[PDB]
From a paper:
Recently, a series of phenylbenzimidazole inhibitors against SaMetRS were identified through DNA encoded library technology (DELT), and these inhibitors exhibited potent enzyme inhibition and moderate antibacterial activities. A representative compound (named P80 in our study) was synthesized, and its inhibitory activity against SaMetRS was measured. P80 inhibited the pretransfer editing activity of SaMetRS with IC50 = 94.6 ± 6.7 nM. We determined the crystal structure of SaMetRS with P80 at 1.92 Å resolution. As shown in its cocrystal structure with SaMetRS, the four branches of P80 stretched in different directions to interact with SaMetRS. As the first branch, the tert-butylbenzene segment lies on the L-Met binding site and forms extensive hydrophobic interactions with residues Pro11, Trp237, Ala240, Leu241, Tyr244, Ile273 and Phe276. Binding of this moiety to the L-Met site did not induce the Trp237 flip like what L-Met did, and maintained an open L-Met site, as observed in F- and A-state SaMetRS. As a result, the CP domain did not bend, keeping the auxiliary pocket in the open conformation. As the third branch, the bromobenzene moiety of P80 stretched deeply into the auxiliary pocket formed by residues Asp51, His54, Gly55, Glu55, Lys56, Ile57, Thr96 and Asp239 from AD and residues Val224 and Val234 from the CP domain. The benzimidazole group formed the fourth branch, and it extended toward the ATP phosphate group binding site.
Methionyl-tRNA synthetase (MetRS) charges tRNAMet with l-methionine (L-Met) to decode the ATG codon for protein translation, making it indispensable for all cellular lives. Many gram-positive bacteria use a type 1 MetRS (MetRS1), which is considered a promising antimicrobial drug target due to its low sequence identity with human cytosolic MetRS (HcMetRS, which belongs to MetRS2). The overall structure of SaMetRS resembles that of MetRS from other organisms, and it consists of a Rossmann fold aminoacylation domain (AD, residues 1–116 and 235–299), a connecting peptide (CP) domain (residues 117–234) inserted into the Rossmann fold, a stem contact fold (SCF) (residues 300–363), and a helical anticodon-binding domain (ABD) (residues 364–486). The CP domain of SaMetRS contains one single knuckle that lies on the top of the catalytic core, characterizing SaMetRS as MetRS1.
Residue numbers in the entry: 1 to 520
The structure:
């Protein structure tokens, strides 16, 4: 009786200032899924947010001569400005400084304490002061021993000697849920995407035994405090992970969003945090007796020919610069086209320009401009109504249009965005080829071939309309501009349902008398 719901999330971003195209990819990709699911008729909720706690945030605020909230408000303003600039269709933005989040972190922690899933112990970690990163005994390089116990070592990055750090900490005993998690994987084979990551998780993390998780610290203050032991602050594991249910008003005075949208249909994230969403998150939800998420999707990185982009190498590509210089459509298209499923992508300015110029401006932009120009020149702007596949090429081309939609659909549902886009561009290329094959200018000579000329123009515009509709989730400007210039005004003709049967324009239409570039 009601629309089926679809809840999609990106990870909450840690506001350390440097937002590169790698961070933009997650929110753009999430936006594409969100827009696609809305067009399919789902009741969609798309969430993003920020991780605002931890020692480092408060150190950075204090160093800058600001309060924690002053500092964070400025950083979050910048992040939300970028999302608005990328036209991210997120329905909400969760900040971990909000009471709706803090209340959940406190209540979840207290519940696990009362159930006995969390117990007090002592955290022991290997810390590198230069790198400010902790490690387990297992990953120290050139470890030193004494009586069989690891006594120290070298950071597996910097190469500086690590320091043994100890502090009182609450532990979450996750190992007892091991069997339940493996059974969950068995009954939900599509849970982890790409599917190759599942056995890597099992082998590297679950098979060797899940260590108790240190979920609190006593060494810093900026964060959620444990109500029944206020010297303890909740660490990132529970604090960050419950953002996905705290955003829905879980345990608030109004849980209606939580009742409607939980569980999440897809958690989208970069591959380096999929182990936390694949193991810790499901086990935490089991401990709270909540339904698990249906799917976790890990995407690859957008590299340079220096390696991972970072502020430290001066490697960072700024999405603001790309948008200001080349436009939004070009930026979103490049991100979604160049990062294939289960692999990494590689950014170069030359590759960006080729995609932008060859695919968008040339293939799609000139197809629209050539078509509109021919309709203005041969029929004074009045596009003859579609009649049927009159030309010998039409039967196979009309079939290709439907095969394009079908292929696009199975690519999108399998999260293969780059293949969906390449499939659409094969159709755009074929439409340009249709012009060369039919030579409209030759047909415009003979007065006998005026119906055949009208048929060709009708097939050009119907091919364009198919392309425009399929690109609606990816490009936020181009499709609107194409519909505008073609003077296709009817909202129904911009939806997926209007692609079921080829040739919906069975009435004459007057196209723009002043066509302009679709891009930039
Ligand atoms: C010099 N150091 C850094 O540049 C530095 C970099 C990251 C820092 C960080 C400092 N201090 C914090 C921090 C610490 C305490 C609290 Br409470 C908190 O709040 C955040 N973080 C956070 C940043 N937060 C994240 O990346 C958010 O991750 C998630 C998002 C959604 C859901 C789940 C997650 C998890 C955390 C499960 C991946 C952090 C701490 C430890 C981590 O692994 C050991 C980690 O893995 C990606 C992320």
């Amino acid at each position: 009786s009601a629309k089926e719901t679809f809840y999609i999330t990106t990870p909450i971003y840690y506001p350390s200032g440097n937002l590169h195209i790698g961070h933009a990819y997650s929110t753009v990709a999430g936006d594409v899924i969100a827009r696609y699911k809305r067009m399919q008729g789902y009741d969609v909720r798309y969430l993003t947010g920020t991780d605002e706690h931890g020692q480092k945030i408060q150190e950075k605020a204090q160093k800058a001569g600001k309060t924690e909230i002053e500092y964070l408000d400025e950083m979050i303003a910048g992040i939300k400005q970028l999302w608005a600039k990328l036209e991210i269709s997120n329905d909400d933005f969760i900040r971990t400084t909000e009471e709706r989040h803090k209340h959940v972190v406190e209540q979840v922690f207290e519940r696990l304490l009362k159930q006995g899933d969390i117990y007090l112990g002592e955290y022991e970690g290997w810390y590198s002061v230069p790198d400010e990163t902790y490690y387990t005994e297992s990953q120290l390089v050139d470890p030193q021993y004494e009586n069989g116990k690891i006594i120290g070592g070298k950071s597996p990055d910097s190469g500086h000697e690590v320091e043994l750090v100890k502090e009182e900490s609450y532990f979450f005993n996750i190992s007892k849920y091991t069997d339940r998690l493996l059974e969950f994987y068995d009954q939900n084979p599509d849970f982890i995407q790409p599917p190759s990551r599942k056995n890597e998780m099992i082998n590297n993390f679950i098979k060797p035994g899940l260590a108790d998780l240190a979920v609190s610290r006593t060494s810093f203050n900026w964060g959620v405090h444990v109500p029944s032991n206020p010297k303890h602050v909740v660490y990132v594991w529970i604090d960050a992970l419950v953002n996905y249910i705290s955003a829905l008003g879980y345990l608030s005075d109004d849980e209606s969003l939580f009742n409607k949208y939980w569980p999440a249909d897809i958690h989208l994230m970069a591959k380096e945090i999929v182990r936390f969403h694949s193991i810790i998150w499901p086990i935490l939800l089991m401990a709270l007796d909540l339904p698990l998420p249906k799917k976790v999707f890990a995407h690859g990185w957008i590299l340079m020919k220096d390696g991972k982009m970072s502020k430290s190498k001066g490697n960072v590509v700024d999405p603001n610069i790309l948008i200001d210089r080349y436009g939004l459509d070009a930026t979103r298209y490049y991100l979604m086209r160049e990062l294939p499923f289960g692999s990494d992508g590689v950014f170069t300015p030359e590759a960006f320009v080729e995609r932008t110029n060859f695919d968008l401006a040339n293939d799609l932009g000139n197809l629209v401009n050539r078509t509109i120009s021919m309709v203005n020149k041969y029929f004074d702007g009045e596009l003859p109504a579609y009649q049927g596949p009159l030309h010998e090429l039409d039967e196979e081309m009309e079939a290709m249009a439907l095969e394009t939609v079908k292929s696009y659909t199975e690519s999108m549902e399998s999260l293969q965005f780059s293949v969906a886009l390449s499939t659409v561009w094969k159709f755009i290329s074929r439409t340009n080829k249709y012009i060369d094959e039919t030579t409209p200018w030759v047909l415009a000579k003979d007065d006998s071939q005026k119906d055949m000329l009208g048929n060709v123009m009708a097939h050009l515009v119907e091919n364009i309309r198919y392309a425009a509709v399929l690109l609606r989730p990816f490009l936020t400007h181009a499709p609107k501009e194409i519909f505008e210039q073609l003077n296709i005004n009817n909202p129904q003709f911009m939806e997926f349902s209007s692609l079921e049967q080829y040739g919906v324009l069975n009435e004459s239409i007057m196209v723009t008398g002043q066509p302009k570039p679709i891009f930039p």
